[PDB]
Design an enzyme around this catalytic site. Structure first.
Site, mmCIF file in Angstrom:
data_model
loop_
_atom_site.group_PDB
_atom_site.id
_atom_site.type_symbol
_atom_site.label_atom_id
_atom_site.label_comp_id
_atom_site.label_asym_id
_atom_site.label_seq_id
_atom_site.Cartn_x
_atom_site.Cartn_y
_atom_site.Cartn_z
ATOM 1 C CG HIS A 121 0.895 -3.420 0.529
ATOM 2 N ND1 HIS A 121 -0.329 -2.914 0.166
ATOM 3 C CD2 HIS A 121 0.678 -4.716 0.856
ATOM 4 C CE1 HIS A 121 -1.248 -3.858 0.265
ATOM 5 N NE2 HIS A 121 -0.661 -4.958 0.686
ATOM 6 C CG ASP A 198 2.462 0.095 5.240
ATOM 7 O OD1 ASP A 198 2.001 -0.552 6.215
ATOM 8 O OD2 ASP A 198 2.268 -0.239 4.049
ATOM 9 C CD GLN A 201 4.281 -8.023 6.353
ATOM 10 O OE1 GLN A 201 4.676 -8.843 7.187
ATOM 11 N NE2 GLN A 201 3.249 -8.255 5.568
ATOM 12 C CE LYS A 224 -0.788 -8.088 5.987
ATOM 13 N NZ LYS A 224 -0.064 -7.228 5.064
ATOM 14 C CB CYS A 362 -0.427 -5.772 -2.598
ATOM 15 S SG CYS A 362 -1.935 -6.794 -2.544
#
Ligand SMILES: [Cl-]
Ligand SMILES: [Cl-]
Lengths: 404, 405
Positions: A121, A198, A201, A224, A362
């Site tokens: 991303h 990261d 998610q 999220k 993104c």
């Protein structure tokens, strides 16, 4: 797994859209909120509100408690060693910048390498690009295969004496591919190289244990994980947070300020300048508790069923291609219909009530590598159902006939 | 015509009890309470109109982008900025100041160059500039203020020089309540080609603000102090000055193109809003600024002026009490000390009576040092506070004096 009971906790899911039943499958962009999160936000503002420099007075105390309690919930949720390893931010993007400015900038220079994946991303790319652009670092991109499968041997080949940092996703926001992060950290740490993960998610869709992962930093975003907008999280191993210089400067991250000089707090406060997102942190706490109440592994099983069922159903649609078919992938399904623009597919099924997203997600370099500019993305959450997969599939078949 | 009892009924928290006693919240300078409409707007957004805002094609993404873009317009109107594209949303005012410090200050201010501040600055309008001192060899210069807390333009003007590259100064002191004559300051600065940042984190709460009439290059404020959500700040910047600034935070939504080899950037304001922004907080802020418009900004100013003057009269009658800052046009922020008693003692004690004040540095140590103290108490008033609450403060302070004496 009582999904009907779960859905009843989320007021928005019962609303109509264009006079039609809502089928929200854009969770990867942002998730809906359970009543308890909304109630926690409301209660904080209505009854227990003040600033949090642990003031002496009642409300400042009650709010500091509620705030510190969230910090603890996050700690437990990530299984971090200590609350002092949890830094609150605006969003995951800011969390990544905090590391990029705080660590990367002082320690990564001309010719040094920053090792990423092709799946990143933009938020796990641009901050590192700043170091390329401003200080002459090189970015290196670990590839992935046509099926979306990540190959550790390919990561390992790109590690070198010049590699100063690894920044890599836990779960691809497009392919759903799960990255074998424990193994990556093992390889990196054997060379003295720190790893940022990261998990924007990953945290939504996987059990996360940052000590079992061993990663130097782990970031995720509140909106999220069924939580408030305006709140992110940076986890960092204490020793790594300590080595970082300040990112944002101001109130609450200093020790002494004089006209002639400034000295700084220690982490996590070193990295939380000015009034933080108080009520958003509290709301995030409620959201992570909601996830614990359902059970993280029960969620994983349910989303795995939705993933598999979606691959079966969409697989039956003639012209449809799925981007990313890794066996252990998260329930994120990016796809295209041959000869039809994603924006067309998306606009149209929105009219049937189905919410997907079309565009870059993104992640342009990933799409360029896969030979496209745009895809549709249906991303599933703990409140979604098999019937919604059917609705998606019915709508997509209808869209294909419409434009064909 | 100022119906404060009606106004108070809009703020649910004000009726609650604290230690079985009536709440008297006078720590508004740290953070303000929220009207029902703000809470309703937050609730409604999450419950009924929630999605991310990259203007998605689908219904909810659309409805949320509208609500979000509408807040941006409310802020623009509230500040009287030329255009919505001059409004950047941030986490808080502190981050707004850093956006300028990193985006403008760092590329354009170097070894020996001067950054001109006031002695009244909150830490958030000091530390970002210190980074440039510490990392690039800039010098910080501090405009003084007199013992009464009065700011003297002639003193600012003397400290302007050929080496001054930026002025960063408060609109209203969070300790003294002193109002800074910002239009005049900008006039002087711009005559030399020097840009001005204004810290309006208190100014926006307590004064009518017109950023075009001020002419300032940037103006920042913070949502939680303007009766709005936590997690939201604002950076206003003149288009030409925003355009000159390189990116601060990097990521999604502030790029134009991202390739493996390079990245190109959006134009302002989006250039400066990396990742998902504080969506619902922006919306809630909008509702808060509308609340302030509904009451009337000049009606508020009159009411807070009455509270200020009455507080100075009442506390002035307390034997050993000293007020720090007595400027004639000051905001309703009253910092004070009782001779021979620690501020933390005074504060802990009147909290038991129900009175909420704050003791400590107020994130303004250099100012305290220049006034000869390490700590003060601060009673900071808002639009919902009353004269009876001033009396309660005064009664409690007299009692605290007798207790520790
Ligand atoms: Cl397209
Ligand atoms: Cl003290």
């Amino acid at each position: 797994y009582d999904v009907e009971a779960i859905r009843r906790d989320f007021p928005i899911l019962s609303r109509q859209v264009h006079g039609k039943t809502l089928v929200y499958l854009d969770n990867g962009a942002s998730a809906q909120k359970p009543q308890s999160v909304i109630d926690a936000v409301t209660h904080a503002y209505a009854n227990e509100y003040a600033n949090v420099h642990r003031g002496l007075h009642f409300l400042s105390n009650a709010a500091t408690d509620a705030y510190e309690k969230s910090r603890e919930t996050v700690r437990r949720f990530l299984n971090a060693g200590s609350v002092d390893e949890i830094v609150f931010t605006k969003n995951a993007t800011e969390a990544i910048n905090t590391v990029a400015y705080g660590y990367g900038m002082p320690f990564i220079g001309e010719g040094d390498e920053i090792l990423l994946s092709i799946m990143e991303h933009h938020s796990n790319i641009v901050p590192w690009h700043f170091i390329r652009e401003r200080q002459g670092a090189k970015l290196v991109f670990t590839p992935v295969d046509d099926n979306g499968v990540f190959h550790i041997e390919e990561f390992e080949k790109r590690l070198s004496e010049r590699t100063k940092l690894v920044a890599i996703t836990h779960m691809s926001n497009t392919l759903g591919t799960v990255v074998p992060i424990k193994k990556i950290v093992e390889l990196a740490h054997a060379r003295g190289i720190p790893v940022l993960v990261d998990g924007s998610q990953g945290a939504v869709h996987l059990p996360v244990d940052v000590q079992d992962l061993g990663c130097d930093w782990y970031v995720f975003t509140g909106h999220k994980v069924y939580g408030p907008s305006g709140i992110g999280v940076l986890y960092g191993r204490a020793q790594m947070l300590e080595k970082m210089r300040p990112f944002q400067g101001g109130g609450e991250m200093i020790e002494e300020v004089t006209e002639e000089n400034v000295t700084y707090n220690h982490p996590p406060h070193r990295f939380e300048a000015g009034t933080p997102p108080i009520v958003q942190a509290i709301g995030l706490g409620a959201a992570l508790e909601y996830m614990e109440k359902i059970g993280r592994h029960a969620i994983l099983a349910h989303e795995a069923d939705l993933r598999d069922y979606a691959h079966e159903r969409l697989g039956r649609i003639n012209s449809l291609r799925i981007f990313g078919n890794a066996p252990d992938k998260g329930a994120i399904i990016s796809f295209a219909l041959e000869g039809i623009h994603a924006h067309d597919v998306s606009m149209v099924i929105d009219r049937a009530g189905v919410a997907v997203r079309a565009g870059t997600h993104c992640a342009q370099p990933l799409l360029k590598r896969f030979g496209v500019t745009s895809t549709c993305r249906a991303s599933f959450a703990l409140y979604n159902t098999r019937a919604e997969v059917d609705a998606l599939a019915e709508a997509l078949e209808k869209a294909r006939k419409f434009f064909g």
